[PDB]
Amino acid sequence: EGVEITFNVNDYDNTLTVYTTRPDTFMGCTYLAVAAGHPLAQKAAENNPELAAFIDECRNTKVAEAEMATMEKKGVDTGFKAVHPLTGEEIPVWAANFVLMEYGTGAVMAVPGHDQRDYEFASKYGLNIKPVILAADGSEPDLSQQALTEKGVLFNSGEFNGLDHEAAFNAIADKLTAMGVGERKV
């Protein structure tokens, strides 16, 4: 059980679509990461040589999902900005070597505040780390060294503040659904 979420991207004729099994974290999404072979990625490589080198480097490294906690994560700003449906604010789209096309939509929503891969990528590239889940003792999570991975009560998540994990999941899934931007998957 997960949700597909569809973002609008400024100066781009298509939409961006992500899949996540953690919609409860959605208010902590601070950027999007697309696979180097994603249509958005090449449309931006058109006016970007750095991206052209990266996409080529990537077309070489057949990265394996299972070898990923081992490989050096690498990525490049696509220049495109996506609009967070609930928040309305702008979030960078990056192209990353750890996102593949073969399985999924080829784009992931990232919450560095609460996914370890997301934290490590955002640390390296000075991307924003937003806390949205509270520590088990009900305090603010310590995000100075690593991501808080635990499931828990949302804060700093606007209307979804105070919901435990299973409530958050549904409340955010239902919102994005009713907004015609999200879709549950069995």
Minimum CB separation of residue 20 from ligand ILE in Å reads: 4
How far apart CA 143 and CA 3 sit, in angstroms, is 26
Cβ proximity to ligand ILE: between 24 and 78 the closer is: 24
Question: Per CB under 6 A, which region of 19-27, 36-44, 84-92, 156-164 contacts ligand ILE?
Answer: 19-27
Residue nearer to ligand ILE on the CB measure, 84 or 114 = 114
Q: Does 110 bind ligand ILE (CB under 6 A)?
A: yes
Q: Is 35 in the site for ligand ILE (CB under 6 A)?
A: no
Answer whether 5's CB lies under 8 Å from 17's CB: yes
User: Contact with ligand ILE (CB under 6 A): which of 44, 91, 93, 111?
Assistant: 111
157 binds ligand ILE (CB under 6 A): no
CB 26, min distance to ligand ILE, A: 8
Give the residue with the Cβ less far from ligand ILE, 80 or 118. 118
Contacts of 171-178 with C-beta under 8 Å, sequence gap 24+, read: 172/3, 172/23, 172/24, 172/26, 172/27, 172/86, 173/3, 173/23, 175/86, 176/3, 176/5, 176/23, 176/26, 176/85, 176/86
Using the rule CB under 6 A, which residue among 9, 100, 109, 134 binds ligand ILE? 109
Give the CA dihedral 159, 165, 166, 172, nearest 10 degrees. Answer: 30
Is 40 one of the binding residues for ligand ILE (CB under 6 A)?
A: no
Query: CA-to-CA distance for 35 and 52, rounded, in angstroms?
Result: 13
Residues that bind ligand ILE (CB under 6 A): 20-22, 25, 108-111, 114-115, 118
